[PDB]
Amino acid sequence: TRVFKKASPNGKLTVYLGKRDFVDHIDLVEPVDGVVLVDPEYLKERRVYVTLTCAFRYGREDLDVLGLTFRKDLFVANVQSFPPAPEDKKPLTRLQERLIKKLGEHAYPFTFEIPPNLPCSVTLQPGPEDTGKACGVDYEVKAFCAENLEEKIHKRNSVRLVIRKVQYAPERPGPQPTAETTRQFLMSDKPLHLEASLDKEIYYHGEPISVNVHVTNNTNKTVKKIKISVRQYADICLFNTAQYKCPVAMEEADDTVAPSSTFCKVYTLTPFLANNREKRGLALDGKLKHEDTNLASSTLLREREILGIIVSYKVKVKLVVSRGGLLGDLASSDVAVELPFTLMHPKPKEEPP
Amino acid sequence: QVQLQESGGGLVQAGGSLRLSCVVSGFFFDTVTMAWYRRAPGKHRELVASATAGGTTTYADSVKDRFTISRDNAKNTVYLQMNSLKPEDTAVYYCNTFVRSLSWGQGTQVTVS
Amino acid sequence: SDIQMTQSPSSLSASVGDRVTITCRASQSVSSAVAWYQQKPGKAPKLLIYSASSLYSGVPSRFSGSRSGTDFTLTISSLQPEDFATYYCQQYKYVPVTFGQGTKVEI
């Protein structure tokens, strides 16, 4: 098998990790196991640190410097690999003992535990005029050499490595997302009944969604237009909480439903990136450097409140209804329904990306 | 750009000798290690190295007592003398170092009969 | 520039039961991006190995892939009567993806 490696500019430090993608399960995290090779020909400083940093990266609204960011930390953990910590006593993984067998006594193991309820790796799509760093939530492993923990780390004496926390679709499919709504009008006696359902609960990225639509028009009115939209909801709880609703795909069929008749049709929508490069704020899966990545996977929560960015999806079905009569244009005539579903990647049967 | 070139090495009869050298290209070679590795035919790539400046004669004890491992400053190279060469001495020798974690050259190659 | 995929040998002969080794060396470093295909004359290519060593679903277990640096090996452990065809390598870490000239195995 293979492993990843990255060296500092001055060569004194070389960080080794076993993989870049770490599977987030329900509550447990996979361990972050690796080694740090410290060359003793240059070591004298008697203390080598490795630091795990969970940071929220964002760009400043008042600065016109593309790519200029600041990182607000959400979780920081440190381990002193050399010399072995007097308190820390941890078992080595099989991978780790193999790494020690390869490098020799100069390889010092380090193992970080990422606590649960932390945000997964999410990258916000940059705008048209920013080419630098990617904003959002990202991870960074920084191993460095210093006299103590307070000193400002010189970049030539350091190495940073981006890693990602990802999630995969649950093995057992949930119950079918269904939703109905009943609009009773004031001046009308018969109600407007709208039924919609999805074919299943878990979808993969780029997979068609089949919308079973049943319209029961017991009214005197006529359904003039059907608006379907997939909207990605992102809740970002950091300083305050914000929300927005952004349509990422849509089709508006002009299919009309006459009075006292039924309707049945299958609509097929696919959310994709190709027609969305011009938008701002769209959530994408974490980037290693600057390569394109797909639409953000659904966030799996634990029943408390979680820091960071929580992503979800709902399908909206909107009927545009004619006006006139007694109340003119005073009363709105729209009918909506919302359908949450799960959008995640299938579990890799063979190898990680 | 990074140029590296193991120099010499070829046909050798047992109980003879060799000489090898390699030069790094580009780096400001002021304070440094020389993290030499060496391979073996169809094997894990393993360490035999020494010689930072200032008196380092270190070894992985398979190959002690025989190799005048020796660096250089002005040429920016570092050498390898060999003696009385074993069927385990026959291998493919690199001159790596994790200054830039140098992707290696192609390796010289020897034989014992 | 284009990645050159030197595949060797161009052709080889073996008998039923022999262990066949088809090497393919890339002109520059390709990480795990290697595929092996089986094409029979007049037929469409069949996927055999992906991600250098991962056996694709539905493919007989006698096929395995290995990687030593920039060298890649396609091994057929127990040569079966239908494994006689032309085999192609493929790098797919850099654009454009380029294929090897092929190795035709005959009885």
């Binding site: 990255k6 390869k102 190495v159 | 992707s103 | -």
Partner: peptide, 14 residues
């Protein structure tokens, strides 16, 4: 004043 790229080394099987 720079940084090396993220490479990829060997690891023997067991």
């Amino acid at each position: 004043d720079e940084s090396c790229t993220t490479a990829s080394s060997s690891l023997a099987k067991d």
